[PDB]
Amino acid sequence: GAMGSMERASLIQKAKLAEQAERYEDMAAFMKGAVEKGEELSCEERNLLSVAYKNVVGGQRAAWRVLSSIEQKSNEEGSEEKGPEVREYREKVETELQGVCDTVLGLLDSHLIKEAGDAESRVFYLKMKGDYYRYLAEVATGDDKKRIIDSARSAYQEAMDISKKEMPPTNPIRLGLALNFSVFHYEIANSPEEAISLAKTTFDEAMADLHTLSEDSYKDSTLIMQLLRDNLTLWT
């Protein structure tokens, strides 16, 4: 790897600089280099890794949606044939997106998840595994779409089982996992009722635990609760 010669601490420092500069591709490459040093990641370092790849894949997903919409309109009746270019370029963006997801999934499998023993790290990584399989599922159409969806579901489910046993209902990692699993149910798994039920139960159990929190923790938890409510408002 091109980051193999850089110190772990220097890679982390540069990832933080890249974030300030909105250079998320650089940020992800620095954090990949840091993971490949082989040491476990701290809470702050896990968040840097997630922010970097979330921004990279977010740009790819947005571009893929634009191109997919153009491609489907070209297949409507009355549409003028324009040749292979729209499909080719959508496929180009799609392949790049799949490559980023495969990179993240590879870091999780070699070897972040297997060394993560604490609930906070293990749930974080399993949620990430669910998220990246979910992004693969958004573009999947072939022999493996079903297996990709089940891989996302399985990772989210293992993360949920640990979170329910080991974390309070207001824990922001637990809340963000439930939020994203609910989005998986609604957008990927054709299960809007499961999505609504999960979001409602997560919100209500968090509500009942807010009294235990400091002012700062209260702000962290209620911010994510608002996203659950925003989805429930959209879905009902």
Binding site: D131, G176, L179, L227, D230
Partner: peptide
């Protein structure tokens, strides 16, 4: 839908 809004994810995290």
């Amino acid at each position: 839908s809004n994810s995290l």
